[PDB]
Amino acid sequence: TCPFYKKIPGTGFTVDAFQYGVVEGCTAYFLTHFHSDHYAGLSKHFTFPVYCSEITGNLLKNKLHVQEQYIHPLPLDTECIVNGVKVVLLDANHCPGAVMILFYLPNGTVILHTGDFRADPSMERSLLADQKVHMLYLDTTYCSPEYTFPSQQEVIRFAINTAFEAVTLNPHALVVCGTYSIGKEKVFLAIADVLGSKVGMSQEKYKTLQCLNIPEINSLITTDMCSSLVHLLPMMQINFKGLQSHLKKCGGKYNQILAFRPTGWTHSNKFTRIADVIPQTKGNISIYGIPYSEHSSYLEMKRFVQWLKPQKIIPTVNVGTWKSRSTMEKYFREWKLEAGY
Ligand code: NI
Numbered sequence: 167t168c169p170f171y172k173k174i175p176g177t178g179f180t181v182d183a184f185q186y187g188v189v190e191g192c193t194a195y196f197l198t199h200f201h202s203d204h205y206a207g208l209s210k211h212f213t214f215p216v217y218c219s220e221i222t223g224n225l226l227k228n229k230l231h232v233q234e235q236y237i238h239p240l241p242l243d244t245e246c247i248v249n250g251v252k253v254v255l256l257d258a259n260h261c262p263g264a265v266m267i268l269f270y271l272p273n274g275t276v277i278l279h280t281g282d283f284r285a286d287p288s289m290e291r292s293l294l295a296d297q298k299v300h301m302l303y304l305d306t307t308y309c310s311p312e313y314t315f316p317s318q319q320e321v322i323r324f325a326i327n328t329a330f331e332a333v334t335l336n337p338h339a340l341v342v343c344g345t346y347s348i349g350k351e352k353v354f355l356a357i358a359d360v361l362g363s364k365v366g367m368s369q370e371k372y373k374t375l376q377c378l379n380i381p382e383i384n385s386l387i388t389t390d391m392c393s394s395l396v397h398l399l400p401m402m403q404i405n406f407k408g409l410q411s412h413l414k415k416c417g418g419k420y421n422q423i424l425a426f427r428p429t430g431w432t433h434s435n436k437f438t439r440i441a442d443v444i445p446q447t448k449g450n451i452s453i454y455g456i457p458y459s460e461h462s463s464y465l466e467m468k469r470f471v472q473w474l475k476p477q478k479i480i481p482t483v484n485v486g487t488w489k490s491r492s493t494m495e496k497y498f499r500e501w502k503l504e505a506g507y
Contacts, residue, residue, distance in 0.1 A: 171303060171480050174279070176271045177251055181279050181303070184208045193249050198281025199264035200225040201347055208232060217248060219255060221263030224377035225348075243293060256292050258283040260460050261349030262378045268293070278474070279303040280482075285462040285470035294474070302476035306483045307461045309494050313431050314464070315457040316440045322356045324440050325426060325456055329357045332424045333395070340420040341396045342412065343428075344404035348374060349460050350428045355386055357426075358396040366394030392419075401427065406448045413451075422450045428458040468501055475507040 172183040178193030184207035189195075197218045198204060208216070210231035215238055218226065223239035226232040240246050242255050242265070252270040260282045269277045276299050283305050333339050341361070343354040358365045365387045367375075372389050380386075388394055399412065404427050413423055424445075434443075435457055445452040462470070471479070479498050484490040 169485075171482055171485065174269055174277060176273060176275065177269065178249055179251075179269070181267065182281070184212075188214075196267055196279075197222055197226075198258065198267065198279070199261055200229075201261065201282065201349075204282070205230070212236060217253075219263045219265050221377065221379055222265075224379075225263065225374070228377055229374060254293055256289070256294070259286050259289070260284060261347070262351070262380070263348075268299075275300045277301045277303065278476075280305045282307070282460070283462060284460055285466040287469070289470065290473050299474055299476050301478045301480065302471065302474060303480045303482055304467075304471070305461060306467070306481040306494055308431060308459075308464055309467060309481070309484065309497060311464045312436060315431055315435055315459050318352065318458060320440050321456055321458045322352055324443065325353060325454075326356050326360045328454065329424065330360045332422075333361055336422055338420050339422040339424055340413070340416065342404070342409060342423055342425040343396065343398055344401040344426065345371065345398050346401040348378070350458055351375070351378075351380065353426060353428050353456070353458055354396060354398055358386060358394075361395060363395045364388040364390075364393065365396045365398060366391040367398040371398060395420075404453060406451055406453075409451050409453075423452070425451070425453045427453060427455045429455050430459050430461065431457060468497075471498075472501055472505045475505070 168180060168183050168186040168189050172180050174181065178191060179196060180189055180192045181196045182198055182204040183189055183195060184205060194215050194217055197216055200222050208226065208230050210233060212232055213236060216226065216236055217238045217240060220239045223237045226237055227234060240255050242257060246253055254268040255265040256268065258264040258266045258281050264281060266281055266283060267279045276297055278299050280303065329341050341357055354365050367387065369389055372387060375383060375387055391397060404425055409423050409425055413420060432455060443454065445454045481494050484494065
């Protein structure tokens with residue numbers, strides 16, 4: 167059964183609610199982004215209207231074979247009417263195609279559903295600036311002050327400089343980047359750009375990236391592994407055994423691997439600066455964990471909410487334990503008292 171925090175009151179609508187069968191009274195199913203915990207349950211047999219971004223729509227049609235007649239793509243930053251209700255999709259600064267959804271209820275209530283997001287001051291000048299929001303359904307993934315991490319730009323600087331140094335010292339080194347979902351494409355595209363290479367990958371991953379409207383993509387990616395010195399591999403294979411095995415397959419073209427695992431937060435964040443990050447090394451293999459996040463830090467989240475001043479907050483992440491829920495509610499109250507709303 168569908169949990170309450172996936173239902174939008176006063177509407178026929180649900181958000182990211184595809185794993186519960188036919189939801190009673192739902193007339194339109196919104197999908198914020200193509201990540202499996204959110205799309206879980208969609209397939210070619212789905213016959214209700216799905217509302218989403220253009221990019222999410224390309225992925226539904228090509229990867230899950232959802233039929234075209236049930237895919238309803240909406241442009242961003244544009245007022246649209248869905249089953250009698252005005253909605254707007256906003257960029258979520260998450261993965262490609264990820265959106266936040268503004269609903270304008272017929273009684274005058276305005277609701278923002280963030281989906282998954284990385285809050286940014288640039289959001290304070292979107293169509294959110296133009297009216298009051300009463301209820302916020304908030305991505306609280308990292309809602310605790312221990313969660314600090316650098317900007318995406320600092321992380322990419324670290325990765326480009328690390329890769330360019332290693333390959334210039336040893337032109338026979340291979341760079342490998344882990345992946346298991348869409349998102350974080352900048353990691354492998356930035357590194358391939360500094361090295362003058364295309365990114366090589368499986369046919370299935372090439373297909374996925376071809377759905378993303380990224381400019382000049384035919385110029386940056388390929389299925390010909392032999393022509394490429396940046397390879398993408400499943401995240402599970404980014405370990406010493408998996409990488410040793412891959413190096414064997416390259417036919418003596420390379421004699422060293424430098425590999426990157428973009429994680430979210432890890433507790434090495436509480437002690438160490440990005441400058442000071444070091445790899446794990448075994449023989450001719452080194453592995454870097456880099457803290458490239460597509461979710462808000464605690465401070466980014468706090469800034470957004472204190473700017474928005476919602477009347478009520480409904481968390482959508484970490485809702486399963488009483489300790490988590492109590493912790494989150496304490497921070498929301500602090501934020502409200504400090505800012506004065
Ligand atoms: Ni996500």
